[PDB]
């Protein structure tokens, strides 16, 4: 009846190497970048400011506040700026998917740019919450684009970034609270899920909407593999993924560190040496910058 011959990582790998599995969508969250040292910016456990005299805590991340008082956000950005941008094994696993002609799209909730550094191109990515990779002047008639190196030196020198052409504020291309979500998120979702053969859901607790609803856009037959520290995505009994019931037929949970799960899957696929070689090479290159 079902595409997976069994509801295990081993069944997923067999399916991936069969003729039926041509197009993979990855859905990724903060869990794939924590081993790179990037904290989960939506987790209350991370330290996300009395000196700023905010009308309410969340105002640091609302667009209309930021546009009037951008200094609190950029002071926070300095505190949190990563010491290094080194993608994880999981990011390079997706680069291997791309190399092998299997990656339809990576939808990411992360703003940390590590997908791009690892070699995913614009066409491969839906950055559902934007990115720090680029920044734009906020004036609608200007919209001059600035690269991350430019924005980095403003953040560290503690100079509020202003546009060289028009002297308006320049904002990192992340989606602030109160901003529209990207049109590309909705356009790609309407097309990609007609074509997907496998969903790889990695490092997300599937608690943030509308990103979490992407799992319900897959065709009914499409297997869904969760690689995550904790099971996630099941329907909420107070009001989905079905891993464990007698009716389960396509969803598989691999519980552990995302890097270790991708390593395990690569090893089943015969890709472990390729993945190790890519990661060691790219890490060596980043370390040598």
């Amino acid at each position: 009846e079902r595409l997976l011959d069994e509801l295990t990582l081993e069944g997923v790998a067999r399916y991936m190497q069969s003729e039926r599995c041509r197009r993979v969508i990855c859905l990724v969250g903060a869990g794939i970048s924590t081993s790179a040292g990037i904290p989960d910016f939506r987790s209350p456990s991370t330290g996300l400011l009395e000196k700023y005299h905010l009308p309410y805590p969340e105002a640091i991340f609302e667009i209309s506040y930021f546009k009037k008082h951008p200094e609190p956000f950029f002071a926070l950005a300095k505190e949190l700026y990563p010491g290094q941008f080194k993608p994880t094994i999981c990011h390079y696993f997706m680069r291997l998917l791309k190399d092998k002609g299997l990656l339809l799209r990576c939808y990411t909730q992360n703003i940390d740019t590590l997908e791009r550094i690892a070699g995913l191109e614009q066409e491969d990515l839906v950055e559902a919450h934007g990115t720090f990779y680029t920044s734009h002047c906020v004036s609608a008639s200007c919209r001059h684009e600035y690269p991350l190196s430019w924005m980095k030196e403003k953040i560290f020198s503690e100079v509020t970034p202003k546009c060289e052409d028009c002297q308006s504020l320049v904002k990192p291309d992340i989606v602030f609270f109160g901003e529209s979500l990207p049109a590309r998120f909705f356009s790609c979702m309407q097309s990609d899920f007609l074509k997907v053969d496998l969903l790889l859901v990695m490092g997300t607790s599937l608690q943030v909407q509308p990103f979490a609803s992407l799992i319900s856009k897959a065709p009914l037959s499409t297997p869904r593999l969760l690689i995550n520290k904790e099971k996630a995505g099941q329907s909420d009994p107070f009001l989905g993924m079905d891993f464990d019931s007698k009716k389960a037929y396509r969803d598989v949970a691999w519980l552990g560190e995302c890097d270790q799960g991708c390593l395990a899957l690569a090893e089943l696929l015969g890709w472990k040496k390729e993945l190790e070689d890519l990661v060691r090479r790219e890490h060596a290159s980043i370390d040598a910058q």
């Binding site: 969340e58 919450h129 989606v175 602030f176 609270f177 109160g178 901003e179 529209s180 979500l181 943030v208 909407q209 509308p210």
Partner: peptide
């Protein structure tokens, strides 16, 4: 559609 906590 706007970005929010949920």
């Amino acid at each position: 559609p706007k970005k929010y906590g949920g």
